[PDB]
Amino acid sequence: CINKKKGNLHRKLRARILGINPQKKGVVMKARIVTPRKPNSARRPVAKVILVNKKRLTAHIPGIGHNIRRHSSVLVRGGGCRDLPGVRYTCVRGVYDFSKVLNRFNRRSRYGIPKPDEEKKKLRRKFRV
Amino acid sequence: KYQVHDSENFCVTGDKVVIKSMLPISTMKHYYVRNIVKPFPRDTYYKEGQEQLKKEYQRLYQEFYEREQQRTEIKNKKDEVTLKSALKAKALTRAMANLRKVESTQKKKDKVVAA
Amino acid sequence: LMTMSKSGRQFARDKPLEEFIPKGLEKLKQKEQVTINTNYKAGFTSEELEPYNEMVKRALKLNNASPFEITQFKVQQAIQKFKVSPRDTGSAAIQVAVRTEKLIKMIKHCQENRQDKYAGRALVRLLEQRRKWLDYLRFTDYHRYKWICEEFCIPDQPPLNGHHKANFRGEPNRQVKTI
RNA sequence: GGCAAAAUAACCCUGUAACUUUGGGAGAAAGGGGGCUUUUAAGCAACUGAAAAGAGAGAGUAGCGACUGUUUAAUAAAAACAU
RNA sequence: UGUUUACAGCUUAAAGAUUAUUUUGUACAAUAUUAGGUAAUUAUUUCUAAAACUGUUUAAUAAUAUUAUUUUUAGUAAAAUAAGCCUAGAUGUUUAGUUGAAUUUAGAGAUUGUUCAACCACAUACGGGUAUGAAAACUACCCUAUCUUUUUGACAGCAGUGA
RNA sequence: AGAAUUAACAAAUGAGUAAAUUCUAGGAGAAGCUCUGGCUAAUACAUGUGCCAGCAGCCGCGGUAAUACAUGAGGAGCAAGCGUUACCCACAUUGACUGGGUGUAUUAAAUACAUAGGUGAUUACAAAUACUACUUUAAAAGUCAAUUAAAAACCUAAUAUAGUAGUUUUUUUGUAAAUGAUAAUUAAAUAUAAGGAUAGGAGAUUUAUAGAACAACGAUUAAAUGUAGUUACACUAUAGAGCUUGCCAUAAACUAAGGUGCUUUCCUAUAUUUAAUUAUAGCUGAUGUAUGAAAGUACGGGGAUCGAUAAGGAUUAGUUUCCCUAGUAGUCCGUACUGUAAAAGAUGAAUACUUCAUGAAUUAAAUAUUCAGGGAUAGCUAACGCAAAGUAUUCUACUCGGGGAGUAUA
RNA sequence: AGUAUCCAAUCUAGUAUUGGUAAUUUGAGUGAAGUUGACACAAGGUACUGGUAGGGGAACCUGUUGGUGGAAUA
Ligand SMILES: [Mg+2]
Ligand SMILES: [Mg+2]
Ligand SMILES: [Mg+2]
Ligand SMILES: [Mg+2]
Ligand SMILES: [Mg+2]
Ligand SMILES: [Mg+2]
Ligand SMILES: [Mg+2]
Ligand SMILES: [Mg+2]
Ligand SMILES: [Mg+2]
Ligand SMILES: [Mg+2]
Ligand SMILES: [Mg+2]
Ligand SMILES: [Mg+2]
Ligand SMILES: [Mg+2]
Ligand SMILES: [Mg+2]
Ligand SMILES: [Mg+2]
Ligand SMILES: [Mg+2]
Ligand SMILES: [Mg+2]
Ligand SMILES: [Mg+2]
Ligand SMILES: [Mg+2]
Ligand SMILES: [Mg+2]
Ligand SMILES: [Mg+2]
Ligand SMILES: [Mg+2]
Ligand SMILES: [Mg+2]
Ligand SMILES: [Mg+2]
Ligand SMILES: [Mg+2]
Ligand SMILES: [Mg+2]
Ligand SMILES: [Mg+2]
Ligand SMILES: [Mg+2]
Ligand SMILES: [Mg+2]
Ligand SMILES: [Mg+2]
Ligand SMILES: [Mg+2]
Ligand SMILES: [Mg+2]
Ligand SMILES: [Mg+2]
Ligand SMILES: [Mg+2]
Ligand SMILES: [Mg+2]
Ligand SMILES: [Mg+2]
Ligand SMILES: [Mg+2]
Ligand SMILES: [Mg+2]
Ligand SMILES: [Mg+2]
Ligand SMILES: [Mg+2]
Ligand SMILES: [Mg+2]
Ligand SMILES: [Mg+2]
Ligand SMILES: [Mg+2]
Ligand SMILES: [Mg+2]
Ligand SMILES: [Mg+2]
Ligand SMILES: [Mg+2]
Ligand SMILES: [Mg+2]
Ligand SMILES: [Mg+2]
Ligand SMILES: [Mg+2]
Ligand SMILES: [Mg+2]
Ligand SMILES: [Mg+2]
Ligand SMILES: [Mg+2]
Ligand SMILES: [Mg+2]
Ligand SMILES: [Mg+2]
Ligand SMILES: [Mg+2]
Ligand SMILES: [Mg+2]
C-alpha cells in the first residue's frame, strides 16, 4: 500500500481518498442520482465533492429532504452506502451548509436535530439550574 | 572479521589465539594478540631450501617520470600506481631487448675481426 | 565451488582456484609414459617373470593395457609411499591421489567429448571432493600435505576459512542484544 | 533570406550526449595552456604573446535521396543521372 | 615600604572528586525495479613539526670487545616500499529522531516513539568562520544568501494574532 | 445546595490550595442517549406507503398482509455520557518461538552439485554451563501481584549479563597408547531401456534403372478436385539415399530433472554384498556454477516421411472451421544462442522405526535380505485418499482474501 | 598592513537521475432487462487446456510437445 504509510501496510484502508483523517471538508460541484444493484431498485441521491486536497469524489445524502445545490460546503463521514457502487463515503448533517431534517423528532443525533424546547425542562447548572 | 597487531610476525592461519582490545594505533587495528591456545605447524624446514638489469631498471623509471609528469600530474593515486605496475612489464620486455642487442653486437665484431 | 572470495558471498567475477601449478599437467603426463614403457601390470613384478618367455611378458606389459589398468599400478605405486599403516587403502593421503589420476582422464575425456554434459558436472564434484580431503589433510598431517603436492604438482593454497569450523571451535563468545 | 561582412582558426593537455548498422557520431560540445627569474618560489609578471603572418564557427530538428561520384562548355550541380 | 589566623576578594602549585573531549564490541527499517565500491585508499618503515636541556650510574635488550639502542600525539599543504582494505546485504536509493517507554495483551508479541525525563541535533538558510573560557552559540560577534522593516529584525521562550 | 474555621508546604515572610472539621436549611433539588427483524436483551400492536419514498455495522428489508421505511403508543439497555467515523491491539493458530499449513482449497520456485551459515555418532576423562539458593550491573518517572484484611505509598520480582556455593536427576566444547554408526577408498563379484564417442548390422518408406505392350489407379460416410492414357499405379530383380531402431515389454528397469531402449569396444557415471583400510571428513543449503522437452532464431548442410501458413476440391451450408487432393517453412545432423510449460509424484532433501494379504528376484555350508503397486487396514486427513501424505528429530524456502494481474512501468 | 595559496553562497551551461503537467491516444474494472453470434462446463456436439509458431469479423481455428482439471470402447 502507498496511500497508507502507518501501522499495518498490509491492510487495505476503509477510506482511501479521505485517508488517515477522520473527516474532511469539501465543496459540491453537482448533485446526481444513482440506481442500486439488481436485487433492489430505487433512486438514491448522490452529491459530488471536490476536496481541499483536489480530489474528485461522490457521497451520500441520508436525509429525506436536502438543501443541496452547486457551491455548497460539506463535511464527509467516511462510512458509505452499501447497495450503491462508488458511494463508500457519506456526508454529515448539522454542518456548514446542510440542514437538519424536518418534521422529524426521532434519531435527532445522526441528522443534526437539536433538542426541542418542549422536552427540555431545566437548564444547565452553570446558570440557573 | 578483525585485524590484529602481531609484533614478531609470529602467527599463521590455523593458530588459535586469544586477542584483546587496544587503542587504535592505526585504522582497522584495535586488537592485538595475547596468546596462542592451539598451534598450527609451520613451513620453515621447507623455506630454507628456497644483475646487469639494475642499469635497465633505473632508466625505465626515469623514462616515464619525465613523460607522465609533463602529461598528467599527481591528481589521483590510482593513476600513480596503476600506470607503474602496468608500465614496467611494457618497459622490461623492451629493456631486456636493449641488453639482448649487447650479445649480438659484440659477436658480430669477433665474427668480422677473426675471419 | 570454491573461489577467491574473502567475504561470505560468492560472486560471478570471483575466479575459481588453481588445480595445478603452471605446467603441472604435462609433467605428470611425462611420468606416465616412462612408467608405461618400463613397467608390468600391477600385481606382477619383473622378478616373477624372468623365467617365463617374452610372449608372456608383453601381454602382462602395461603398453598393451587399458587406461583403467594403467591407473591401478599408479595407485598402488602411491600407496606404498603415502600410507600410514600396512594394507592402508582409505586414508586421506591416498584419497587425494586417486582424484589426481582421474582428472588426467576426465579432462582428456571432456576436451574431446565436449557434449557429455554429465561429465562436465562430474569434474565439479571431483575438484570439490579433492578440495575437501586436500584441506582435511593439511589439518591433520601437514608435513604429509607438502610431500604430496610436490609429487602431483599441486599448489599450496590454504583455505580462506582458516580451518575454523573443524578445529577446536568452542565457547563462542558472549554478547547481548538490546533495542 | 543574417546573402555579404565579422568571428572561429595550427599544436599539446583535460573532457566529451541522445541516437546507432557497434564502424561511428566526434576535431562533438564545454574549458585550459604557451613568458622571465632564481629558487623550485602557497615567487615575479604592469594593455596586447604558438608575440607579427598562416590553418574549423558550433549546436537542435524535419523533407528527398542510401553513401564517394557524374551532368545541361556559355544563366539551372540539384531531390535528376549512375551505382 | 602597618598587619593576608581580623573579614572579603585575587594569584600559584599538589592531592583528590566531578565534568568535557578522544576509543572499541554487539544491538540498530525496507529495498538488489542498485552490486562492485575505496585511491594517502589498507599495512609497515621513514621524514618533518610540537612536547625542557645535558650528564652520571644502574637495569634490560641484540651480538658480545662491550659499545650502541630504549617515548607520545599530529600532518600526504611529506615521501618511499609492498599491494591491500570493506563487500558475512560495502556502496547507492527511499523512509525515519533513538531510548526509557505509551496503547493493547493470559503470556510471548505486535503498532506507535505525543505528554515528562536522558542523550544527539537544529535556532530564517542541510551554509562559511572567529574571539573568550574548564565547557559555547542557544537572543554573542563577522560574512554570504532568503524574507521582512528600518539599516533594526527572523517568537521551533511564555502569553497572543493570522494562515 | 449554602455558610464558616483550622492545620501543613516558612515554629521570622505565602501566590494559591485540605481527597481535613464543624454549623443551618431541607429531605434526590443531576439526566440524557441509543434500540426495538436475526447476530442482540426488547411488539408477530395500530396507520399510511407500495421494489416508490427510505433504512442498512454484516445478512438483508419494501411488489397491498411491512414486529425491519415514516407516524403513534408501549417496551429494553447503557448512563454523564450514548451514538457515528478514522487508525492501532486483543478475540485469531489473521502471520505461527509459545503456535499453523503446503497431494487436490489460485501455497515447495524445473532440477542437482555447492559457498557463507545452521546442524549433528559411541564410550571413558577433564572443564564449563544449565537447574536450585544467594549475590553485581541495567537513571528516576511509569508499570509491577506492595499487606498485619490498611489508597493518595518508597512491591525487587521477572528478563538479560558477570560472579560464588552445592555436582546430584541436563546439555554443550574438546582431548584420548581409544572404540568405530554414517560418507568415502581399495581388492573381488554382480547389475544398469543412465550419458557421449568409434565401428558395423537391420527395418519399412521413397526415388531411379531394367523387364512386361495391362488401362485405369488413389482418395472418400459417399463424392469431387487430382495422377496416367506411349506402363502411370502394381509385381519381380539390382543399386543408392534420408529417417528409424521390430518380437524381446513388464508395476517390481536406470539416472538429479528434462528424458532414455538394436549389437561390439574404450571412456564417464550410479547402485548392491563381503573382507580390509581411514575414522565424522557427514546431513542440509541463499549468493553462485552447471544442466534444461518441444516449438522458434542465425549460418552451413541435408531434404524421404509427416505437415502450420496460403491455394484448390467439396460438402453441409447461407460466412470462418472440422473432412479430401497437392504440399512450402519446419520436421533430421553439426556450431551457438534462446532458458520458458499442467517443468507433475501438482507431494522440498536426509536419517531411524512401523501392518496383513498377494506377488517380483537373488540363491546362501563365506555372506542373508531387497523390491512392487494392481488389494486392504492401523494411524493421520475437511472428505476423496496415502504404507507414506504415518510416529520422531535437523536445516532451507513460500504463504497477510479475490478481481486488477504474471499484466503496466523501469 | 599586504602579496600568493585553500574554501562558501549566488549565477551560467550541458549531462546523469528522479518527480510534476499536456494536445492526442489507449487499457481496465463496474453498472443496466441492449445487438450480433454460440466459444465454454455433458464426449457441449470436432475431448478441454498448458508452452510455442502461424493465421484471424469477435468469442476463436490449425500444426508441434506435454498434462488430465474428459467421456467412451471388454
Ligand atoms: Mg557568410
Ligand atoms: Mg573574413
Ligand atoms: Mg576522438
Ligand atoms: Mg567515437
Ligand atoms: Mg576542440
Ligand atoms: Mg552533431
Ligand atoms: Mg571548443
Ligand atoms: Mg600569431
Ligand atoms: Mg582546420
Ligand atoms: Mg575549409
Ligand atoms: Mg516524418
Ligand atoms: Mg516517396
Ligand atoms: Mg546523393
Ligand atoms: Mg556528392
Ligand atoms: Mg562539365
Ligand atoms: Mg551552364
Ligand atoms: Mg552553376
Ligand atoms: Mg534515380
Ligand atoms: Mg508483556
Ligand atoms: Mg520525542
Ligand atoms: Mg507537545
Ligand atoms: Mg514542556
Ligand atoms: Mg520561525
Ligand atoms: Mg542549552
Ligand atoms: Mg508561543
Ligand atoms: Mg505556617
Ligand atoms: Mg439538616
Ligand atoms: Mg430477541
Ligand atoms: Mg400496513
Ligand atoms: Mg497473532
Ligand atoms: Mg518440486
Ligand atoms: Mg532446488
Ligand atoms: Mg559447511
Ligand atoms: Mg528503573
Ligand atoms: Mg517402369
Ligand atoms: Mg535424466
Ligand atoms: Mg527443435
Ligand atoms: Mg536451412
Ligand atoms: Mg498425473
Ligand atoms: Mg514431464
Ligand atoms: Mg509445483
Ligand atoms: Mg499431522
Ligand atoms: Mg492437507
Ligand atoms: Mg494403498
Ligand atoms: Mg510401497
Ligand atoms: Mg505433504
Ligand atoms: Mg491480489
Ligand atoms: Mg490470477
Ligand atoms: Mg507467459
Ligand atoms: Mg513482463
Ligand atoms: Mg517512460
Ligand atoms: Mg490527455
Ligand atoms: Mg459450444
Ligand atoms: Mg468443443
Ligand atoms: Mg472469429
Ligand atoms: Mg470436464
Among B3, B46, B50, most C C-beta atoms within 10 A, so best to mutate, is B46
What distance in Å separates the CA atoms of residue C3 and residue C17, rounded to the nearest whole number? 6
**Would an 8 Å CB–CB cutoff place C22 in contact with chain B?**
no
What distance in Å separates the CA atoms of residue B91 and residue B60, rounded to the nearest whole number? 6
Which three cell numbers, joined as nine digits, stand for A37?
Answer: 444493484
Residues 58-87 of A with CB within 7 A of strand G: 85
Instruction: Specify the resolution in Å.
Output: 3.7
Query: Do residues C136 and C166 touch, judged by C-beta distance below 8 A?
Result: yes
Q: Which residues contact A22 (CB under 8 A, 6 or more apart)?
A: A78
Q: In angstroms, what is the C-alpha Rg of chain A?
A: 18
Per DSSP, C63 falls in state G
Instruction: Please tell me whether residue B64 adopts helix, strand or coil conformation.
Output: helix
What distance in Å separates the CA atoms of residue B53 and residue A118, rounded to the nearest whole number? 120
What distance in Å separates the CA atoms of residue C141 and residue B41, rounded to the nearest whole number? 9
Method of elucidation: cryo-EM
Closest alpha carbon to C100 in C68, C79, C126: C126
Q: Which residues contact A73 (CB under 8 A, 6 or more apart)?
A: A25, A26, A27, A96, A97
At C113, the amino acid letter reads N
Please state whether beta strands B4-5 and B29-38 pair in parallel, antiparallel, or not at all (unpaired).
parallel
Please state whether beta strands A31-34 and A73-76 pair in parallel, antiparallel, or not at all (unpaired).
unpaired
How far from A12 is each of A5, A20, C159, C175, CA to CA, in Å?
11, 12, 52, 40
Residue recorded with cell 589398468 = C69
DSSP alpha helix (H) spans, chain C: 24-37, 46-49, 54-60, 67-79, 92-112, 117-140, 142-149
Chain C nearest C-alpha distance from B13 (Å): 6
Closest alpha carbon to A27 in A8, A7, A2, A52: A52
Per DSSP, C62 falls in state G
Q: What single string gives the DSSP state of each residue in A36-64?
A: --SSS---EEEE-EEETT--EE--B--SS
Gaps in chain C following residue numbers (C to N > 2.5 A): none
Residue recorded with cell 463508500 = A88
What distance in Å separates the CA atoms of residue C165 and residue C147, rounded to the nearest whole number? 25
